[PDB]
Curated annotation (Swiss-Prot), chain B:
SUPFAM superfamilies cross-referenced by the UniProt entry: Purine and uridine phosphorylases (SSF53167)
Catalytic activity: S-adenosyl-L-homocysteine + H2O = S-(5-deoxy-D-ribos-5-yl)-L-homocysteine + adenine; S-methyl-5'-thioadenosine + H2O = 5-(methylsulfanyl)-D-ribose + adenine; 5'-deoxyadenosine + H2O = 5-deoxy-D-ribose + adenine
Gene symbol of the encoding locus: mtnN
Name recorded for this polypeptide: 5'-methylthioadenosine/S-adenosylhomocysteine nucleosidase
Pathway: Amino-acid biosynthesis; L-methionine biosynthesis via salvage pathway; S-methyl-5-thio-alpha-D-ribose 1-phosphate from S-methyl-5'-thioadenosine (hydrolase route): step 1/2
A GO CC term assigned to this protein in UniProt: cytosol
Amino acid sequence: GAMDPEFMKVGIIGAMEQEVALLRSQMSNPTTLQLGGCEFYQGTLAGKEVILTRSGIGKVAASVATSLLLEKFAPDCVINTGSAGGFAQDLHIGDVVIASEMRFHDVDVTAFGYEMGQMAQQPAAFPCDETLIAVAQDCKVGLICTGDQFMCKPDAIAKARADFPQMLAVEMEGAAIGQVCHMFKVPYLVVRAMSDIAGKEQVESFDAFIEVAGKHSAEVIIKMLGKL
Amino acid sequence: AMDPEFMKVGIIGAMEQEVALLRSQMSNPTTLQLGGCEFYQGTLAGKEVILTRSGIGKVAASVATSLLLEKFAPDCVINTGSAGGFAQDLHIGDVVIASEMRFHDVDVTAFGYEMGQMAQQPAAFPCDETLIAVAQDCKVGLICTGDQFMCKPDAIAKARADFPQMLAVEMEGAAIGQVCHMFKVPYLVVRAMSDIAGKEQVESFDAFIEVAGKHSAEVIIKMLGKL
Ligand SMILES: Nc1ncnc2[nH]cnc12
Ligand SMILES: Nc1ncnc2[nH]cnc12
């Protein structure tokens, strides 16, 4: 809207090909840069200058990709798109969650008095940018947690639910992207779509619906770009 | 020559206590602040080095290592610092040279990967065999990495059962190894023990982090004379 800040160069990150393929196919003559085991596609998409990033899976790869995206291309914000596992009551496959904030669910330095999920020298949560959140809303909103585990065992899900009763979904990169953006002081947002639901044949669900999750998340991003 | 030479050496430590001696023996270092990390360039014990203060944990170490590699392109990366000891005959102040790094907290085994193996990565990140030999001339084996301070009994027991040959744990080594794998750069992790599994690890850590970080860094300084 008129009173909102502007974002002239948009960085977009997805972990897997299934999460970036559609977005890439809608870019105009994209340049490709291979670096650090990641890929960066530079060009125009839905009327915006963007750098689309295929990061690889997990906290470390996401961190590499985001570091290089920021240091080499300096976008004005970062949007993470992709798939996630649903925890909240009324989530179904393909449903979209917009993160108001990211936390790590597997970080534990509580022995030194940090909150569960809080990394030393870091805030306990990484809030997504107030403008980006509202733009996504205009196109559920809440906490998504990140960890380097694919969560499908009853004990793991129960513990995560106990540590984070308000967690709506789980995935493997969003809070790493948020921490890197915090360290560079760059606005970010995470949008994810459910490829599987906690407790419900999650391996087979993920294999079957990763592509529809990646698609629904990417469609949201395309509409967001239309409004930035 | 035909010698296995590393001309520009990256060195990375998580905390001020792990890098302070190294920096203090550098000849008029230049300082750069980027991505929440610090990079000091200069000469040290005769060698061209970039010393990096990364911060704690996998994400911070990954940022630090990826910036170090892309902006400075060292010929090898050596990680130094403190760790928690699991091996039977390990004690406060003992040094461990990593043969390879693994993650103890990564679990995508539902998709067929080994325990500790992240999807799209190798199960383990072997340290460069030349760097290992140099370090030895100045225990050798597996160190595991996770984003947790391992002191609760059930967590120590799970890690021991998952990785029976794990000698020690810390919070950055395998991330550094993964980034170096992603960039194809040789690396090595060297740690000194600030605490031992099962033995008042919080108080031990606070009391021994300074001297353990110094001990590890002193190995590194020895190494740089022979590289
Ligand atoms: N169940 C799950 N756990 C972790 N990351 C996921 N991404 C999609 N589904 C997931
Ligand atoms: N017990 C421990 N767990 C994790 N990282 C450590 N670094 C030093 N001691 C440690």
